[PDB]
Amino acid sequence: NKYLVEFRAGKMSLKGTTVTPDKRKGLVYIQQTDDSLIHFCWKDRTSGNVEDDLIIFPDDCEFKRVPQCPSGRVYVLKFKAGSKRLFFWMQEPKTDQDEEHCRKVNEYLNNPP
């Protein structure tokens, strides 16, 4: 029940080919259960409740940056087998740890303990 990763990030909405950020800034964190199943959860900072919780298996998805609108920190989660795409934006004021979260997320989604 340990959290592999955790950082402030909000979700976005993709309609057709346009991605709009959601003001419901949350927290993107990863937790591995005793079942060795990595739990990808997104909790809204508004209430601090876990709004999203999806188990992600190795090579199931890929966490990468979104070089479409350079200005801040935007990442997209693509399910290699889920054929699903999610968009998130980091609420961290400094990117000194942006790469760490990015690297850890991938390492926890494709390289679990």
Partner: protein, 77 residues
């Protein structure tokens, strides 16, 4: 619209299913093709666990879609 079910052992089992087929039906297919009881059959796809009562199309499960099969430990220390 068959789907590939990969077990924890790494063994992959393709089972013929329909897009409107329910998750329960899919689990049964695994039982006959492996012998895993429904209680121990935990199908996971699209990053989300397949909740009973849902359909394959619900999780955007297409043909030859790889599904993660999780089995209960049924033990401890």
């Amino acid at each position: 619209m068959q789907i590939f079910v990969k077990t924890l052992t790494g063994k992959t089992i393709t089972l013929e299913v329909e897009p409107s087929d329910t998750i329960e039906n899919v689990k049964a297919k695994i039982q006959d093709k492996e012998g895993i009881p429904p209680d121990q059959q935990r199908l996971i796809f699209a990053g989300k666990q397949l909740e009973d009562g849902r359909t394959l199309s619900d999780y955007n499960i297409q043909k030859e879609s790889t599904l993660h099969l999780v089995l209960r430990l049924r033990g401890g220390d």
